Amino acid sequence: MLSYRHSFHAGNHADVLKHTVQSLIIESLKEKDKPFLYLDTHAGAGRYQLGSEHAERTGEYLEGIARIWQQDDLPAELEAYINVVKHFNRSGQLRYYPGSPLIARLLLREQDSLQLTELHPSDYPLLRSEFQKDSRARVEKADGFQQLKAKLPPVSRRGLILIDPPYEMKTDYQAVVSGIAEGYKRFATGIYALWYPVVLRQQIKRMIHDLEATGIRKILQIELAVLPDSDRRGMTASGMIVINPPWKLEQQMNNVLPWLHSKLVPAGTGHATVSWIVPE
Ligand SMILES: Nc1ncnc2c1ncn2[C@@H]1O[C@H](CSCC[C@H](N)C(=O)O)[C@@H](O)[C@H]1O
Ligand SMILES: Nc1ncnc2c1ncn2[C@@H]1O[C@H](COP(=O)(O)O)[C@@H](O)[C@H]1O
Numbered sequence: 001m002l003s004y005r006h007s008f009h010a011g012n013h014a015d016v017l018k019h020t021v022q023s024l025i026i027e028s029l030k031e032k033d034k035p036f037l038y039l040d041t042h043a044g045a046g047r048y049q050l051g052s053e054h055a056e057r058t059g060e061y062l063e064g065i066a067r068i069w070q071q072d073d074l075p076a077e078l079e080a081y082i083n084v085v086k087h088f089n090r091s092g093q094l095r096y097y098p099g100s101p102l103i104a105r106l107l108l109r110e111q112d113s114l115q116l117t118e119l120h121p122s123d124y125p126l127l128r129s130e131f132q133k134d135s136r137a138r139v140e141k142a143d144g145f146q147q148l149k150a151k152l153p154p155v156s157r158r159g160l161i162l163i164d165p166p167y168e169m170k171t172d173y174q175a176v177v178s179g180i181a182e183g184y185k186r187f188a189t190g191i192y193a194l195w196y197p198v199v200l201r202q203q204i205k206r207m208i209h210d211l212e213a214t215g216i217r218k219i220l221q222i223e224l225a226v227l228p229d230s231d232r233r234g235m236t237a238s239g240m241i242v243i244n245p246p247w248k249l250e251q252q253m254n255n256v257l258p259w260l261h262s263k264l265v266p267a268g269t270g271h272a273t274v275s276w277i278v279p280e
């Protein structure tokens with residue numbers, strides 16, 4: 001029961017990919033003056049201490065955000081994201097990492113809104129504090145999957161829905177698919193971004209098969225692996241599955257994925273790909 005702590009992983013290569021994609025979608029949504037909703041089902045604490053015992057135990061951020069945030073040849077597509085990270089580390093030392101809600105908080109406009117949920121009794125109060133002074137946001141201690149029913153469609157009728165569970169419970173692999181189906185039924189023009197870990201490739205193949213079976217079209221897959229697939233314990237890769245991606249996203253990812261992979265994976269192992277699960 002909610003034993004997962006994101007602090008162990010905050011700012012690792014999966015977070016870099018996830019937040020790169022999140023930021024690019026937000027920038028696309030901002031192109032039109034009309035307001036939109038940012039809905040984060042599994043929101044986390046908001047920000048993470050990289051000097052914490054958890055972060056330093058794995059040191060995963062050292063192979064993630066650390067490898068790109070001070071690069072002089074940073075691709076333009078990453079500027080919005082990296083500028084948020086720099087805002088939280090103005091000393092130039094890498095000490096704090098902004099989670100999805102804070103990236104959203106700093107990229108959204110005055111007219112936009114945020115709806116965030118987190119169940120963990122350490123992380124929810126921290127998330128609440130991050131948004132006490134920002135009336136654009138609503139933060140609730142409740143099941144994120146339920147929000148795909150309760151909060152869609154938004155009155156603004158525009159939005160990004162980030163679904164980023166920890167997959168501590170293996171039912172998550174089914175729940176993300178059923179949850180997307182329910183949300184899509186209520187709000188078919190929404191942009192849905194689903195993060196997934198590759199611990200067992202067969203789990204992911206089954207998940208993608210289930211997603212195809214919903215009949216939903218226009219499904220883009222973006223994956224970055226630091227190691228080839230393995231049956232061993234660890235996560236060798238992660239990806240973003242994006243439903244209704246903005247028209248530029250595929251090209252933007254083709255522009256930045258090789259650079260990202262070269263920086264995050266100096267040994268050149270694994271892969272990085274963008275492809276359609278379901279076209280048109
Ligand atoms: N059913 C559920 N509803 C809401 N939060 C959940 C949940 N099950 C697990 N969680 C929380 O989901 C989170 C996944 S990590 C979230 C990271 C965040 N989206 C970011 O990018 O920074 C954990 O904080 C965990 O406590
Ligand atoms: N966000 C993440 N980033 C990197 N590794 C992760 C993440 N979530 C889970 N893992 C790893 O995936 C493996 C399987 O998780 P578990 O079975 O819960 O230990 C463990 O090695 C975890 O550390």
Ligand code: NA
Nearest residue numbers: 164165166167
């Ligand atoms: Na996770």
